[PDB]
Amino acid sequence: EFITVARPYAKAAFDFAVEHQSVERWQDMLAFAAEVTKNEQMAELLSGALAPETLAESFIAVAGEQLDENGQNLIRVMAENGRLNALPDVLEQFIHLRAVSEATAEVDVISAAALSEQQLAKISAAMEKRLSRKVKLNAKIDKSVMAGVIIRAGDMVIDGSVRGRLERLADVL
Amino acid sequence: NSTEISELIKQRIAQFNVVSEAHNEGTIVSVSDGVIRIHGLADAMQGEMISLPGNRYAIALNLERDSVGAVVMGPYADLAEGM
Amino acid sequence: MATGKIVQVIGAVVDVEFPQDAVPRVYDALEVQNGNERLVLEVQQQLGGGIVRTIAMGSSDGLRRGLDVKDLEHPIEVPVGKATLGRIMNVLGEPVDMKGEIGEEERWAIHRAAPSYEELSNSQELLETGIKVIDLMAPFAKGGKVGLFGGAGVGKTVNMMELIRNIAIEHSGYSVFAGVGERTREGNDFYHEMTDSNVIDKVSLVYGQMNEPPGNRLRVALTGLTMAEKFRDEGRDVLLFVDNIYRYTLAGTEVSALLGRMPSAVGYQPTLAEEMGVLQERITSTKTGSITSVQAVYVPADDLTDPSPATTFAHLDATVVLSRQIASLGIYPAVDPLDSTSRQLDPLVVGQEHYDTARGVQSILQRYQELKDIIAILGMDELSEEDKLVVARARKIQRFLSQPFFVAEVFTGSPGKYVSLKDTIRGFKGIMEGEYDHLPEQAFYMVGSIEEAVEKAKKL
Amino acid sequence: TGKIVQVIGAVVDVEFPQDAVPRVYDALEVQNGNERLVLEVQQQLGGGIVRTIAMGSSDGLRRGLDVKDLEHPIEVPVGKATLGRIMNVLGEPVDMKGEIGEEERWAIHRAAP
Numbered sequence A: 001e002f003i004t005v006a007r008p009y010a011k012a013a014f015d016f017a018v019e020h021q022s023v024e025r026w027q028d029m030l031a032f033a034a035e036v037t038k039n040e041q042m043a044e045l046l047s048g049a050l051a052p053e054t055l056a057e058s059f060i061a062v063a064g065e066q067l068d069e070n071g072q073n074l075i076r077v078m079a080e081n082g083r084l085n086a087l088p089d090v091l092e093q094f095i096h097l098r099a100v101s102e103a104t105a106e107v108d109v110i111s112a113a114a115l116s117e118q119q120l121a122k123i124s125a126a127m128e129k130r131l132s133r134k135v136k137l138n139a140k141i142d143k144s145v146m147a148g149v150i151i152r153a154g155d156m157v158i159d160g161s162v163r164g165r166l167e168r169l170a171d172v173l
Numbered sequence B: 001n002s003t004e005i006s007e008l009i010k011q012r013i014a015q016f017n018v019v020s021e022a023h024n025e026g027t028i029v030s031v032s033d034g035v036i037r038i039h040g041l042a043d044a045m046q047g048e049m050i051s052l053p054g055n056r057y058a059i060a061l062n063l064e065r066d067s068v069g070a071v072v073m074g075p076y077a078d079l080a081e082g083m
Numbered sequence C: 001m002a003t004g005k006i007v008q009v010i011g012a013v014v015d016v017e018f019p020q021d022a023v024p025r026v027y028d029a030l031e032v033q034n035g036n037e038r039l040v041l042e043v044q045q046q047l048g049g050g051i052v053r054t055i056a057m058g059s060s061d062g063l064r065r066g067l068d069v070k071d072l073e074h075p076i077e078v079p080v081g082k083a084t085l086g087r088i089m090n091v092l093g094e095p096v097d098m099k100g101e102i103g104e105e106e107r108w109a110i111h112r113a114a115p116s117y118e119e120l121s122n123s124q125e126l127l128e129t130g131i132k133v134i135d136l137m138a139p140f141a142k143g144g145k146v147g148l149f150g151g152a153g154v155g156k157t158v159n160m161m162e163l164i165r166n167i168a169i170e171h172s173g174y175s176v177f178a179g180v181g182e183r184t185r186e187g188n189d190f191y192h193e194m195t196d197s198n199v200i201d202k203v204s205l206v207y208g209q210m211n212e213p214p215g216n217r218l219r220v221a222l223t224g225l226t227m228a229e230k231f232r233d234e235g236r237d238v239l240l241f242v243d244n245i246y247r248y249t250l251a252g253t254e255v256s257a258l259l260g261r262m263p264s265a266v267g268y269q270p271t272l273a274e275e276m277g278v279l280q281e282r283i284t285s286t287k288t289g290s291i292t293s294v295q296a297v298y299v300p301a302d303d304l305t306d307p308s309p310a311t312t313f314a315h316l317d318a319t320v321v322l323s324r325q326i327a328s329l330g331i332y333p334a335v336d337p338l339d340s341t342s343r344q345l346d347p348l349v350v351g352q353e354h355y356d357t358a359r360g361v362q363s364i365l366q367r368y369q370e371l372k373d374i375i376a377i378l379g380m381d382e383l384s385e386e387d388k389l390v391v392a393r394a395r396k397i398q399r400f401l402s403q404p405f406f407v408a409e410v411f412t413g414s415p416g417k418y419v420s421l422k423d424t425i426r427g428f429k430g431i432m433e434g435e436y437d438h439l440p441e442q443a444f445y446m447v448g449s450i451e452e453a454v455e456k457a458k459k460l
Numbered sequence D: 001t002g003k004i005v006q007v008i009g010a011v012v013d014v015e016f017p018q019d020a021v022p023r024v025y026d027a028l029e030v031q032n033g034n035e036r037l038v039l040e041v042q043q044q045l046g047g048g049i050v051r052t053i054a055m056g057s058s059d060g061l062r063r064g065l066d067v068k069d070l071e072h073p074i075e076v077p078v079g080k081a082t083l084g085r086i087m088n089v090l091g092e093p094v095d096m097k098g099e100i101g102e103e104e105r106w107a108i109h110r111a112a113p
């Protein structure tokens, strides 16, 4: 998986975007690079064994609406190492790194039906006391929950569904 | 801008006139010690005979992703890249 | 509908990519059209995002990258039941005898777990065989595992054809023959033999020969068990003959490195002991029914220390070690009485006279072995008289272990002999007690009971 | 025209343009300090790189040096000229006598009869 080779470039970009106060621009630039890297013809150019210099020109020319510091170099250095398929992973790495520095958590909540917006605001302020970050809830309407809610906060989760309790009781028996 | 940006890319790619290989064709990308590596050649079956320049043939023994390994049946010092 | 595409084909190993939802689980089957040929793939690993690595149950030739694959959501499933009796099948349970459809009522998956510890049933119901040396040195119970160990050409097949003759015809229960990695000629010769003798109506045959791609040779042993386990669960007493346990492990070795596994001690796969265990712990006699099994075990290079024979020694109730020396000397069957043994050789469960005879025989032959190199260098004249005696009785005992078989008549031009267990004891005890000390060694060679030893002695 | 990109002991990797990459047994020439070194191509790798074996001492070579692509194999003098003389692997005279007066030179990679 490309996550490991993404990490040096994603850290170099994230460490660099804060030296130049343009994290927000870099993020959409990488989301651009991740969308073009999915194209079926571009992936054939990537698999086509050009030499890195001429392949680099054949990629930099096609993605010209990028700064000199940003586009023309990150895309070239990853192209010499052949890492450009890592770009969808470089994106998520970059986002996570940001959410880390900005003390944010992209908390997810899951429920059988919509919450009352008092329930949901209570959930926000309580997760912000459980954690030490500004949370950003997003809900999901999953009918298997039946009742209650799931709160997922990255690698950590908090099951309040009735289905989980039902199947827990089925094993306490 | 996903649909617009991916159209922008499709047009710039076509306008640069980079283009796919045909199926059943490929190019030699490495020649070494009587073993060649071919890029492309998507419709190649394992054990198939692939015609080289000349009347020479190679047997496709290894079907990796993004590469083919073929073995040359005869003298191989005449081959190169781009064939 | 089809749902996956082939992404690599390196030798016998095929990788298939699927959507990241509904990826096939391990040991599932998959299907692909290899031109006109329907090819089955078995899933071996879920690796990476959406990819599965698989083994072809057929030739890998003719496959292209980008072929569509359809996932069957079950393991390889085989016909089981009475409809399998009298029919040759391949690893997939497809008829290879050209007699038409199998006509099965039920089909069972070849991958299943072994019986639980509380299901196992104890037995000491000793089988009798015509073979003198085996019934003296390694008698075995109904419901037990028997292993025939030997290198190439020592008599594994001839012994197994003799044991099939002696045991299976008296047995009224159904039998399974699993020809793992057998020679195709020997499989045809067996099929015709059973067809002539009219015992083919109570044997089911599964054959995976040497020419077949590794997946067939790998999985054909499990189709044999799946049929025998169906008969055992009906409650029958079953006879299971396996032509080589070794070429199951070898079929694992061939494909193991292409599956990405790091190599082990003698180039074997890292999973040799688990692969042997998972197969051999299914071959058991439960409370519902009994499987009795005879397995031949190839011994690479004739060294009993090689990991593959070394591990399988720990699974078997009786182990009949054949030796190339005794075969080269021309004594047949080439059983080594010092190395072979059974856990049923107990004074409690055999007759105590049997046990005493066996201990005597082994003690004498061991005492001969140490004298051998002494005589070879320093000469027979430098023995003492009581050693000259025990070296003679040792030679007489080592001749009386030989025997003509009905199935080894074609090789030697002589009739075949069946000896009852009692007659065997009576003879070896008489020889050790010296009641026949005056007879020459050839009066014991290639004879039946000791009454036939005195008849041939008279002719001599 | 090409440039040295790796020097791993006795083998030397040279990068050429995409359209003039030397054939599988051609010879190249480098000025290694004050001395000229011949290289023999062994492998065409991808991207116009070739692996070569140095026909001489490989010390002193620096990455980024410029090689010269001769368009023939190693060709050695043969016949009556090479008859009282000691010669090198490159077919150069190794005795202190003058040049070998050959009429013909043969490439050393030939086919069996």
Ligand SMILES: Nc1ncnc2c1ncn2[C@@H]1O[C@H](COP(=O)(O)OP(=O)(O)O)[C@@H](O)[C@H]1O
Pocket: C150, C151, C152, C153, C154, C155, C156, C157, C158, C159, C332, C333, C405, C408, C411, C412
């Ligand atoms: N009891 C026997 N009588 C006569 N010949 C035998 C006997 N056992 C083995 N042989 C000879 O040795 C050969 C090799 O043994 P066999 O069982 O056929 O193969 P393997 O022992 O490798 O399974 C037999 O084909 C036969 O030629």
Ligand SMILES: [Mg+2]
Pocket: C156, C157
């Ligand atoms: Mg055999």
